[PDB]
């Protein structure tokens, strides 16, 4: 895996420095370690491929070394080094694709393939370079068993939930009570609704809660947080809980009394702010829970008297939302988000050669379903794949 | 710079591999380069050979 | 923890092997490595404990080398070793109480004392020895990310969760339908309960079902699976879900009709077992599926028929139970089980020396609240602790 990434990072520098016209000694360092490279990988042979429509390609490395001795390089050095270029990074995308595709229950963070298994011998242990990229560096991190962190810009930490809760029901569903919620990558949107609106709680104050129990310990999140949830704000039908019959939601939005959003570790408050919206900060937490409370307002206008009165027939339900939007966040573990694309490539890769659902992975890569059930196992392939992706990502473009 | 090899026949190996044209670039200009490690004080030398 | 592990290992085989009257070539390859233990030692200043209870010790080393030219040990070699080992047993005792008393949020993983912190250096590490203890060699391969495996006898992986579940209820409690289980260490005991014997049921068969989540995922697990639960077949009055009232359970007992029992990982089905009972395995698991049913009986003797009216009054209540016995299993991750003593040697020293509650671990050190909320640095802090236990278990007895 390291000497992938040194040979990925070779090929994209000498793409990059080996140029027509540049000095030499911009290049003397990248000359040299190119030459390493073609000595260590000459004579050997590799077999990419074999599962799905992948091709079986078969791998044989015998080319002559670059010159040392130009002071500006001219375009005959240029152009051979584009043909062992160009040849060696076919190599290492198939190498990349041959790995990314595979996977395993026992220990995913091993290699799979078998080139990738042959290219971790101590003979190939030469052409490693600098490990600069942070996939890598969390790769070499977390092979020392060192704290490692992600930095994700609005990071798919919350699977597709969109659900409600029913406190108080009834087979009329003219009188309801309880919390509905959208959770769905990095948002939480929230609205707890009563259709009496407090007219026989105590105190006229009903108390909503709602409880996002996280699979992945986030660090240092930067939270939106906002009130009046948008998506449950207009009226709408719904089916029941078992899915028999349909009921009505005619939302009239109050604000939210009484916002409480903390954030928990192992059950311990971390941070907590009450009453205070805009962006917010969490350090350290695996649980978010908020808690905001409808109150019934004591003075009315005759224009707002109408709409909540003491009898049964409500037509206007009083109703009371949060957002909360994590823009970014540092998680130990690999995610998806909305800046890498690295899922995409894994995803593209395994949907291109029509790849059989293997044992880890859900079928057609669910992230929802990658993220609802997040073993160790899967967090260690994934982790594989993504750092593979990164490689492949920073070659084939 | 000035270096040390630790015996006359590694001296002589050093000049051989070094003259020749068939070693690699970075072995031939790495045989100019190695340096000893001379430490006066913990009473330690380190000589390449 | 390496050094640590080291220089207990070498206390116990110099309390084991420097015998009088013995050899020398039985003991000439200890000596040396216990020689080499004093040599790096010398001159050096260590200082443990300052927490609750624990007293503040310092620790100077000026000691001679052991003799190297006895043929068989005598008893004045013996009772110069005797007093060289005791004060460096002294030692690691302390050690070994300050670096389970103590904890960390951020990384648990990490020597939290100071003369831990201090051993942990190169210049200790020629104190090195061999590390064969399943808990050193776990550290040791966790240390470099590779698969562990702690073999348990009877493990504590179930919180202690004794409760019930009213399918069919109401208000006078005369006609229920619904299961009851108690989770406790390694055994589960189910016992799903209807009061009209579905006599109102399609096809007279009513499905129960409890599905029971793991924290961490077993592997390799031999589990007695018994019929006819025995803690939920005799007669008891139960508090109800609101603490209100209480409501009583008169049992008879059919036996369990079509069992399945499903062990999934990642909502997979691994291992499925049909109306088989005695010792099943369960190879790779982390959540167990019971699904027992009772069906009413056709034919019955007129001592059964008196039992199971068509009408309202059920003085009998029929009952159907499954017992489930984790024997032994797997595990990756630490816990507790009844072969180990480590537990019980971290909680004694925890309570010997009134520690306060820190951010960590539950107060008390409770083991329910513990595995109940099985977070992954509470899981660093725990094998850490459990292994500084499993040493100081090797030297204090
Ligand atoms: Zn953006």
Known sequence: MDVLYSLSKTLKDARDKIVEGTLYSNVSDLIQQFNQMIITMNGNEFQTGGIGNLPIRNWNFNFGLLGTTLLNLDANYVETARNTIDYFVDFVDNVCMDEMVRESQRNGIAPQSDSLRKLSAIKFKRINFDNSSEYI????????????????????????????????????????????????????????????????????????????????????????????????????????????????????????????????????????????????????????????????????????????????????????????????????????????????????????????????????????????????????????????????????? | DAGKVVDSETAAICDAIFQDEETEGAVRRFIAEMRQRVQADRNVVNYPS
Chains 1, 3 share one sequence.
């Open chain 1, 137 to 397: 560096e969390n790769w070499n991190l977390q092979n020392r068993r060192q704290r490692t962190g992600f930095t994700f810009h609005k990071p798919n930490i919350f699977p597709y939930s969109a659900s409600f809760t029913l406190n108080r029901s009834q087979p009329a569903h003219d009188n309801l009570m309880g919390t509905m919620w959208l959770n769905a990558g990095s948002e939480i949107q929230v609205a707890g609704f009563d259709y009496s609106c407090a007219i026989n709680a105590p105190a006229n104050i009903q108390q909503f809660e709602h409880i996002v129990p996280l699979r992945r310990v986030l660090t240092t999140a930067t939270i939106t947080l906002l009130p009046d949830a948008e998506r449950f704000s207009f009226p709408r039908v719904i089916n029941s809980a078992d899915g028999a019959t349909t009921w009505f939601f005619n939302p009239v939005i109050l604000r939210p009394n009484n916002v409480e959003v903390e954030f928990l570790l192992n059950g311990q408050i971390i941070n907590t702010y009450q009453a205070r919206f805009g962006t917010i900060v969490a350090r350290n937490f695996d649980t978010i829970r908020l808690s905001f409370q409808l109150m019934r307002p004591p003075n009315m206008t005759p224009a707002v008297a109408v709409l909540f009165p003491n009898a049964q027939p409500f037509e206007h339900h009083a109703t009371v939302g949060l957002t909360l939007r994590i823009e970014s966040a540092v998680c130990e573990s690999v995610l998806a988000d909305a800046s890498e694309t690295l899922l995409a490539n894994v995803t593209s890769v395994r949907q291109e050669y029509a790849i059989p659902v293997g044992p880890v992975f859900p079928p057609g890569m669910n992230w929802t379903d990658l993220i609802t059930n997040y073993s160790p196992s899967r967090e260690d392939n994934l982790q594989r794949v993504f750092t593979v992706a990164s490689i492949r990502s920073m070659l084939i473009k």
